[PDB]
């Protein structure tokens, strides 16, 4: 394993994933994150790229939103859930970025994980300071 | 390889893939097709299986619709387009099941493939029967 946590995502979601997570967890608290766009080689087969970085990651961190659960992005959480039932060194954490209604024919096991996995509610401006409840819960769930 | 064609999808889109495509191409013309639900053993990683059946397939068949291009199924087509780059034994065909708009955020290679790949139109009751124009074009693009 080569990454503390892999960060999957659909201010904004994108700002929280790509600027805020590495700012706090990497640049301030020294963890080792994986972002698709930074750590993987362009081109390539996206299905393997994710199964690979999942296999080299200690946690999974999923920023849930309506755009996530109704888009192609949900491919990433399914793989994580698949790979997690084989290895439980892999611990998955959801993040409630905003309300999302959950879709109606998500595959069996993805519905299942939504029902039991730990969620940290993202609460906007309050959550942004590095000493916030949000990051506190994030750090608690890191290796 | 070992399959003539892999049939990817998100009456109904599922009836086409699961029922009519075996009825015509498999049964009626003796071809060898791969359906995810039928020809891979359950469990295992969904992203390892689509890459493996694509690698084993002479042809890729993709039933497009808004459901497909806006859901995670869009990653079956993204893999094949990259894999088909490496390997010229793999030829891809697009099926237009019903009108869709090219989603604004597909991977660069997927958008390219929508632009240039051979596209056969599903025309409802007219295309069902074996000697229909849709199956004629289909059998042309088979091995």
Swiss-Prot record, chains A, B:
It comes from the Eukaryota. N-glycosylated. Induction: Induced by IFN-alpha and IL12/interleukin-12 in natural killer (NK) cells and T-cells. Residues 1-142 form the TIR domain. Within the IL18 receptor complex, does not mediate IL18-binding, but involved in IL18-dependent signal transduction, leading to NF-kappa-B and JNK activation. May play a role in IL18-mediated IFNG synthesis from T-helper 1 (Th1) cells. Belongs to the interleukin-1 receptor family. The TIR domain mediates NAD(+) hydrolase (NADase) activity. Self-association of TIR domains is required for NADase activity. This is Interleukin-18 receptor accessory protein. The gene is IL18RAP.
């Amino acid at each position: 394993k080569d990454f503390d946590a892999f960060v999957s995502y659909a201010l904004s979601e994108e700002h929280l994933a790509l600027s805020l997570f590495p700012d706090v967890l990497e640049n301030k608290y020294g963890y080792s994150l994986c972002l698709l766009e930074r750590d993987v080689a362009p081109g390539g087969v996206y299905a393997e790229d994710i199964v690979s970085i999942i296999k080299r990651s200690r946690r999974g961190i999923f920023i849930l939103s309506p755009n996530y659960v109704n888009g192609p992005s949900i491919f990433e959480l399914q793989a994580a859930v698949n790979l997690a039932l084989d290895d439980q060194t892999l611990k998955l954490i959801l993040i409630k970025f905003c309300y999302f209604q959950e879709p109606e024919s998500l595959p069996h096991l993805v519905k299942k994980a939504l029902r039991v996995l730990p969620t940290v509610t993202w609460r906007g401006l309050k959550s942004v300071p590095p000493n916030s409840r949000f990051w506190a819960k994030m750090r608690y769930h890191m290796p």
